[PDB]
Amino acid sequence: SKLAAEQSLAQQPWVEKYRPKNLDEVTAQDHAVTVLKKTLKSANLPHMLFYGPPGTGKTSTILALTKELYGPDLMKSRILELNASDERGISIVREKVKNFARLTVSKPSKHDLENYPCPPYKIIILDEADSMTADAQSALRRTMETYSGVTRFCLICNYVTRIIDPLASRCSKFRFKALDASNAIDRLRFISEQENVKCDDGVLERILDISAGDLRRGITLLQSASKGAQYLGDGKNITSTQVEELAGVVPHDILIEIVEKVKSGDFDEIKKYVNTFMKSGWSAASVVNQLHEYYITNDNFDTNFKNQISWLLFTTDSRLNNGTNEHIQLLNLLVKISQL
Amino acid sequence: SKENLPWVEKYRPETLDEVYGQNEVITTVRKFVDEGKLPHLLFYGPPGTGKTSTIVALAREIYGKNYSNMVLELNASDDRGIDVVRNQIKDFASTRQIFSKGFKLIILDEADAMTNAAQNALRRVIERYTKNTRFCVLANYAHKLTPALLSRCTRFRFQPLPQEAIERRIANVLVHEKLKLSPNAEKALIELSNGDMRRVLNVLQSCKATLDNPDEDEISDDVIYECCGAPRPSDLKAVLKSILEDDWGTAHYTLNKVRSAKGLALIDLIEGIVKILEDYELQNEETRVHLLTKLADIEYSISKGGNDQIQGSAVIGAIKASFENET
Amino acid sequence: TLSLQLPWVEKYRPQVLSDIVGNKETIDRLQQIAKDGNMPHMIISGMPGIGKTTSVHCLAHELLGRSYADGVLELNASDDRGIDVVRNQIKHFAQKKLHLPPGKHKIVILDEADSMTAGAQQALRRTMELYSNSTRFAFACNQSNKIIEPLQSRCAILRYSKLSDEDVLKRLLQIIKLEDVKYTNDGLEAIIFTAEGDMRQAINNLQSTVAGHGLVNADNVFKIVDSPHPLIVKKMLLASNLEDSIQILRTDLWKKGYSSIDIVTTSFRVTKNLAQVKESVRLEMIKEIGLTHMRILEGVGTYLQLASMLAKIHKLNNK
Amino acid sequence: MLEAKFEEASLFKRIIDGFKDCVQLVNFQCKEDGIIAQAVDDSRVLLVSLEIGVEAFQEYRCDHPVTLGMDLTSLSKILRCGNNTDTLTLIADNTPDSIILLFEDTKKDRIAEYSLKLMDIDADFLKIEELQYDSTLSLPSSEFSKIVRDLSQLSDSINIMITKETIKFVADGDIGSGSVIIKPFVDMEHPETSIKLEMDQPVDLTFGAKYLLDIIKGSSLSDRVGIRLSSEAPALFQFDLKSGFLQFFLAPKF
Amino acid sequence: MLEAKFEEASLFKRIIDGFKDCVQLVNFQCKEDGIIAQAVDDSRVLLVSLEIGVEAFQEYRCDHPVTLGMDLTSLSKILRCGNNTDTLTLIADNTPDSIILLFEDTKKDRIAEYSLKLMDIDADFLKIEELQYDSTLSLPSSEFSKIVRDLSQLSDSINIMITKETIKFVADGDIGSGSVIIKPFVDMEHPETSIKLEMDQPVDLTFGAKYLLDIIKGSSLSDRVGIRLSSEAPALFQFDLKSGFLQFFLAPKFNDEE
Amino acid sequence: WVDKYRPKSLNALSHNEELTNFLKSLSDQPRDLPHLLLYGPNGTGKKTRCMALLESIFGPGVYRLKIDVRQFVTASNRKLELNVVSSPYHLEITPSDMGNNDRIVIQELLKEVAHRYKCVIINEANSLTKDAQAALRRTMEKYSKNIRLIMVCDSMSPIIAPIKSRCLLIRCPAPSDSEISTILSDVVTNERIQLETKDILKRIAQASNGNLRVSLLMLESMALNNELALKSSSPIIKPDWIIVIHKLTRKIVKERSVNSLIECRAVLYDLLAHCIPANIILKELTFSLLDVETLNTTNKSSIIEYSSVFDERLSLGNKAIFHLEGFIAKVMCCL
Ligand SMILES: Nc1ncnc2c1ncn2[C@@H]1O[C@H](COP(=O)(O)OP(=O)(O)OP(O)(O)=S)[C@@H](O)[C@H]1O
Ligand SMILES: Nc1ncnc2c1ncn2[C@@H]1O[C@H](COP(=O)(O)OP(=O)(O)OP(O)(O)=S)[C@@H](O)[C@H]1O
Ligand SMILES: Nc1ncnc2c1ncn2[C@@H]1O[C@H](COP(=O)(O)OP(=O)(O)OP(O)(O)=S)[C@@H](O)[C@H]1O
């Protein structure tokens, strides 16, 4: 029963092993969980719309809230979870969602009311609402407006612009903030201590620095570093270099070579060095980000050069965000910034 | 009980006297109903202006407490096709009331999602059965309605809620709830609403939940800004000043510390800087052209993701290069 | 309240072809046809609210007299008008025996003919061809292109045009005289301006203004009715300086609750139908209005996108 | 609480067959003198109203009325387990989230039990029945079904006209017209086949054939059908049960 | 060669009705002691296995086994000519490209003969039946069909739970939950209605309702159905024939496995 | 041949020793293993390394696999036919074998399938539509104790950020020319080839750009032309489409007109009709146009800018020739 769950969690990757089960495990998204804890004692949970960067804990927060609300018994009877792996057209929204909303709430047991608040409403959550078409979204308007007495709607998305304006107005907007080093160092250190991850001083803070506001990627990188340090068995501590090696970060010397080729060099030398660099597998997004950090941070370039480098890096990132060829985009970016 | 509904649903107007903001249309509709000549209505307006509440209170005032039986209310949640029209709407219009004597009311809420064939079939239902029933079409976009259907109804445009009416509703809510609100906090709340009562009610409930107290204290600007995650005018103007005057590295550091100290979003800062720079009396419009174009491009790129630092540096560089033409 | 009164569009709906203030040529044509008889198959096309359905109704009534009930078959878009209906009911009505005067014929009125399916329209050809001596067909549509060419080849084509200022003014004056309403010249001018050749919309706005304020004045008409959405958009696009267009977009459109989709779409229409500027600059403005659109439809619809669209249009106009 | 045991699950199954298709939501209410149920279609032209007295049950206990709403489709889906001869017991607490249907065979053997989820419906039972109707008539329900099934083919509207000693059903559409004329008569060879008619005023009403077709289903509950017509209200078609009745109120056309 | 004559074409038609729908390809093999046939569905959760001994036929001759594969749909399409009372003879040479079905009426009168094209299937008969199952039970097949037809409406999964002297079928889904509880009992007034149960170990398995629905078809071949369950293997539902049997082996759902 | 000499375990790998050690570290504890995404240049050997890692997570029977078929029904009666590579320990799906119906196959098959878990290898994850990736986003997290994904791709550019975060990222850098030469040496000593001078092998690497799959295939193709005896000046065997692209660039730099644009469109049509992707065509065309010594830096910069623009266009469009002809016309206008 519970022991099987404990063992399955212990044999699970750290992303799912340390998933927040209660509203207190949320480390940084405090403004939303404060309201969620206050409404736990009341019974006026409004329709909610979670939006923010990926890996901020929206799904974990709503799961912990539904748990703390309904208990592990009513967790499976008063919840309608619809993900992006299911059909969510107009037909589905009109039939299934509306039939579940029109239905009455299931009767709680005697053990439920003694430990959990058991609100008189159920919860219908729609994860990854970006893939929902606007007509199927507008179909949900009156469905969530008239049956609010018996069901509550929780939308979850990454881009709040993909959801129509009426739905965004009907739901309370909860913006999840990026999890940088400051507001996630406590959670990362807790995960490291619970797994006996022996690292150096500036490793964890560096990991989140590579994560760029993503605790899931940081936990995955920490798990990979711990596995790589346990395989060696040397008993030493994990270093920031070993972490940034497996995180896809280009070494500093290779980036300085690119800066030298951009500063001094013609089209042919730059093209040859780019062709050689693309042989070693590096993500073009990470290279663009590192070049942006170097160029904007270095206090040795003119402001007129800085405006142009910022606009060129922005254009290159916008083009790379569409599935383009990394080699062509990187070569074009380096050539355009070399003419400056 | 009504104490379980959210504040958006709990405070839904039940009478025409509780619908604030709309005065020129509310008085005209009241006169239409009192004098008897109620034509086919077309309530066009943005979300959260009070069109559904207005028509519900109107049907309540017309038919009484039995509104839910003497009125045919169809919406996008219900299947609205051409056959649905042909059967249901025509059978409702051709027949009479089962509870009393009088004209009928068909409320086609959110009728901007109806098929073109459905509207083509309904435009002759509205013109044929016009002595025993009426039609009310609610819309947010007037381009999704055919011109033939658009010409058969009297159009009423629901303007966004002004300051006086939204403050009156806020005072009504603060009377109904054991809650106090600061004047500057109220002004900041009205600023982040754009005439949307739903947003105001939602964030008011959320900041009441944020209070953490038995509500013996007041709600200040800090509570509102920390609960809605919206940037403050102080940090907004500080970032704008550091971008316009200070150095590139210093501007980058200022933007980073501002967006990381309160967890602010880059899109909110972009919109705030756009709103602030709209009052700037500037030179030759080339700077404004470049600024608007680059800011809209960066906003459209943010709407799809990417590197937040790269986009922030892009915003800084765009504003700087746009203002470099003003010299 | 217990009951309502009939609207002025339905109450004062013309019942004789002389009361129609539409296109004089086609009106006198239909009047002479009803006087002499031998009504041929016809297709009346035009724009909504100019007197197309009323015209054919008056023609059928005057041509059939008391036999209108059993000699006229009305089929609107609200009724099923598929292949099965054309096969069974229309054919049974055309084959039906009926003793009529030696100058009249059975009339099949088909309202909204542009919505009939291709199969029904194809089946109607021989249906109207084999019984063209005892059954006549009158189609009323808004787009004559939606009706197949074989059907148009067997009938006359009557294209109704917009109603000039004089005709709508005369009809409104007749209605005011028949209703004893207090009015003024500027109020009627504003009504006709907001009507845009739409007689039905004009009468509806007049009745609404009367029942809402009593006096038909330009102030009342403007406070109850909206200045033609397209005209403010045209004045915004035709602005010479960027700040003027921005202030117009802010105050007239954005501060009054007009959605961004309506603004951009109305904007596209205004441009397409523009004639002040050249073709190439119009195409560039349409391109900018449309690239923006592509962003408006993706959910990025805000004021900044419309401001950037206006800035790009001005940059194109900036030589 | 709700505790109603039907001798034969078949009776309840036929009753629900009557609400079937023509309505989606049904509001039941059990009380000291029995069970009632009402359902109105979306267009609000048809009301289905049921009444089952205490005596129609093999066992009925009620010390506290319970009102419960449910989806008709869900109910019928479950209503084919009665074996017809099975015993059926409807069970629910005073504040139910579900309704329990318990089918059992005589012997302890097989017990099929269902727990149907309920819907919340604003309690608002209508009381539209009239004191006097313009005309009243009863005739075998199988005959009424045939009359409806005949005419239905011709039109979407079937007119019922009543004059002294004459009842006439008429349909007229595309392919032509049809009519069925019946006359009152007492058959002593078996009065369940008689056709009675009491006319206080001639009536002439038109009904949508699609609805009359829904109504004829009641034949399975009673040998005769009573039809009450008025120019002032919805028509009443009634099928009597042993201690009870199933009623269909249908609003005439224009 | 294949030479098997059924007294009544009806028996073969009902047997094939059992493979029908749930499987597409069937591999038959005739031999000295009779005919066997196996078919596995695409997802491999159901195996349909047939055995007809020599005595089930009116005439059977086999001096050389023949294996032949065919499309089930093609076979059933042809399997409605038996008049049920017609005589049916299955015929095939030692290296067949087709299978001949010959239906004849008593008199010389009418002779319907078919030549069905065969499919080549790698011969690989499975032998997954167990020595002992956790629990074994038999009950009237019409009763089992009703039990399955009841619960099916509620869910895509029907659980079978066995404890001492108790068999319980359960379904739980959207509209609610249902259960059918039966108890072992000997009816002397006619033992074909009895419900036997031998439990060596309590069992609790879940099956996909769509599959149990395919399986109930066997009711048309036998009055009773035998159900053998184990936590170590696919469940066995068996319908006995006079000299033979039709068996359905169904893999329990792992959590999601039919 | 490429297939006759291929490593089957982690100890049989012969390049990227740090990557082999990282894979051994990741396979030391196989049950607490998150989802993996192998990214890098095409032809590096990531598909062999994933199978070698599976050979460490499971028994040697992972390579004994079989091909089955599964049918799917879309919203209409169009039947989607998809073949599946299955093994008693893992299964491989390639959603790049159909059109916009990747989401259906992904969701249904993965839900049906969902040591103790069964591995899933998604081949060519770049062809996965955004809707299919969104559908897989929650399937990756809901079933993490029964299904582990190993997605093989050549560039994480079209992969969405949620999927990137939901799995570990493993880069596979192309092997150095020295390692390629050492591998070709063992191959030619095992296949009994005659080398007059060893340096030719190095040149093969210099003609493959890190691609081992292309290197071995070209070595074997030129070994059949030299009759199993490679000389000091054996010609380099280039694919036909590369020669067509080179002739196209020669035509471009020689003539810049609409009459030549017509034959350029014809060549593009003939290339696209023979199962050649348009993105690779554009990449090779641009890279070989930059190699033209007749042009200057001003021409090459405009060429690379137009190629990036039209690559974005092609990634946002479906009619590939509509973008290829536009890029060719823009290059003609530039020169
Ligand atoms: N605030 C947080 N506190 C603790 N752990 C967190 C937090 N946010 C994310 N995590 C970890 O990251 C895992 C993923 O959480 P999710 O809620 O699925 O992230 P996400 O916001 O849903 O990203 P998506 O699904 O791509 S939008 C959790 O199981 C935790 O292990
Ligand atoms: N004028 C108003 N006065 C008071 N409350 C209002 C007003 N307008 C909106 N509200 C509040 O906002 C809620 C939603 O109003 P609705 O009428 O549903 O919005 P809407 O105008 O119909 O726009 P939609 O539904 O998105 S198209 C109401 O229940 C009120 O609580
Ligand atoms: N020429 C006219 N003279 C007088 N009243 C008119 C005239 N044209 C329209 N009207 C008024 O407008 C009402 C509706 O006219 P219709 O003929 O139905 O409009 P329409 O030209 O057919 O366009 P549709 O029906 O939208 S395609 C009539 O009942 C009259 O009250």
Ligand SMILES: Nc1ncnc2c1ncn2[C@@H]1O[C@H](COP(=O)(O)OP(=O)(O)O)[C@@H](O)[C@H]1O
């Ligand atoms: N460790 C290795 N040692 C030697 N050759 C290898 C090794 N791994 C892969 N190869 C070979 O190098 C080539 C790489 O191409 P390919 O196998 O298509 O790459 P991928 O595995 O990424 O699809 C093939 O010929 C492959 O067999």
Ligand SMILES: [Mg+2]
């Ligand atoms: Mg999520």
Ligand SMILES: [Mg+2]
């Ligand atoms: Mg509304």
Ligand SMILES: [Mg+2]
């Ligand atoms: Mg008309």
